[PDB]
């Protein structure tokens with residue numbers, strides 16, 4: 001009743017990568033390697049790189065799912081709060097309850113698991129554009145970490161899985177996420193707290 005978060009490169013050497021966006025007050029998405037934590041504003045583009053050592057088979061897919069980080073909340077489905085699930089912000093593909101969306105990919109599919117009720121969004125693997133060495137998926141997080149009746153200040157993890165055409169596991173990586181108004185300030189604060 002809890003998805004695994006164990007990092008697993010698998011046969012294709014799968015792992016994530018993040019840009020270096022800095023901590024200026026204006027930054028909208030910034031990743032802390034020291035915390036393995038992405039800080040982002042509500043509904044803003046979060047570029048996540050996908051890296052492999054070798055090409056996975058045709059029909060391989062990449063799925064994203066959120067879980068609560070704290071063990072005492074891990075069995076609770078992460079969903080949008082009672083306010084945001086009712087706001088008129090649909091993109092025509094993502095169900096209004098889903099926290100994580102993929103931006104700019106008409107082949108994205110959204111799953112409400114019939115057994116666990118967890119939400120996820122999955123896209124087909126596509127090779128990098130000519131001249132690039134990795135593929136980037138653009139995610140959006142559709143609720144603040146602080147939203148009452150939803151995440152309610154509880155930290156979450158995003159689990160990214162590489163899957164075969166039947167959904168079997170080929171690779172896994174993960175990162176913590178805080179969705180907040182000032183990601184640059186919050187990253188600096190939490191990195192300072194860690195250094196102390």
Ligand SMILES: CN1CCN(C(=O)c2cc(I)c(-n3cccc3)c(I)c2O)CC1
Pocket residue numbers: 050051052053054055056062124125126127128133134135
């Ligand atoms: C050194 N080799 C050069 C040739 N490779 C690719 O073109 C490649 C193919 C795929 I499909 C993907 N891909 C994985 C998940 C989503 C897209 C990626 I990231 C790639 O780098 C593999 C690595």
Ligand SMILES: [Zn+2]
Pocket residue numbers: 080081082083084085142143144147148150
């Ligand atoms: Zn919300």
